Design a protein around this ligand. Structure first.
Ligand code: A1IHQ
Length: 254
């Protein structure tokens, strides 16, 4: 195929509402789980021609995947996709919308930025327990609300391979290194200038573009819609900026 200079998953597959949804992981180190259920929600819709149009549950993955790390303390990407393939994941929206089988138990909050929600602060919740029961008002049993994938894989550390993967199969999960200057991000194309490493983060790459010739990836963060560019940010593309091209994980439903 021929890679266009820009691409936006939200515009190619506008029926799939999840693609344009920005979630909030709250006072929980569950970024690994959010980039996963987000992109799986997207891919379930894309690769099924719109048939599954759902919001997969972040708390189901977070709480039940023992091989994925330590829940709100952090986790690993590849295993989250293996869990989706082997056990599947039920539906579940944010806490506020309280929809689907298992909605998120934690409230929106501001992640080192100004806005309408309360500050998150530094305190971290304990990982919720693996319930395996839907909320009472949801009319399907847990076991049967499960959405499974068929494969899971890493994507080659190559810009063009990542681009081809996104355009054909949909948004991907990716890890990158967080430096202190990322916490002051409001807008623009980000790149590490100042600050020391605070860890890694896991997000959803949904596209790319170019602004006055500067190439970037377009990425959905999980710190709610008040953060960055309406919940999204942009980061230098093509230089493995903060290892943005090195920890790409995805999977297919068929
Ligand atoms: C979010 N929210 C956070 N982050 C996270 O989780 C991360 C993701 C990633 C991964 C990989 C790479 C990258 Cl760049 C990113 N993670 C982390 O940090 C990890 S934590 B842990 B692991 B091993 B496993 B379990 B898990 B835990 B520790 B050890 B390590 C084991 C234990 C949070 C912030």
């Amino acid at each position: 195929v021929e890679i266009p200079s820009s691409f936006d998953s939200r515009k190619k597959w506008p029926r799939c509402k999840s693609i344009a949804t920005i979630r909030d992981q709250s006072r929980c180190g569950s970024c690994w789980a959010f980039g996963a259920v987000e992109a799986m929600s997207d891919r379930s819709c894309i690769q099924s021609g719109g048939k599954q149009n759902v919001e997969l549950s972040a708390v189901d993955l977070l709480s039940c995947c023992e091989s994925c790390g330590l829940g709100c303390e952090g986790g690993i990407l590849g295993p989250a996709w293996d869990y989706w393939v082997k056990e599947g994941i039920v539906t579940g929206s944010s806490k506020e919308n309280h929809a689907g089988c298992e909605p998120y138990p934690f409230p929106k909050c501001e992640h080192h930025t100004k806005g309408k929600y309360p500050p998150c602060g530094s305190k971290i919740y304990k990982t919720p327990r693996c319930k395996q029961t839907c909320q009472k008002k949801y009319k399907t049993p847990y076991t049967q609300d499960k959405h499974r994938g068929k494969s899971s894989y890493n994507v080659k550390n190559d810009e063009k391979a990542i681009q081809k993967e996104i355009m054909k199969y949909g948004p991907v999960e990716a890890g990158f290194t967080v430096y202190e200057d990322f916490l002051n991000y409001k807008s623009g194309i980000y790149k590490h200038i100042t600050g020391e490493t605070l860890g890694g983060h896991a997000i959803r790459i949904i596209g790319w573009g170019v602004e006055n010739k500067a190439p970037y990836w377009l990425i959905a963060n999980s710190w709610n819609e008040d953060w960055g560019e309406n919940g999204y940010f942009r980061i230098v593309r093509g230089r493995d900026e903060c290892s943005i091209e090195s920890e790409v994980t995805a999977g297919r439903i068929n």
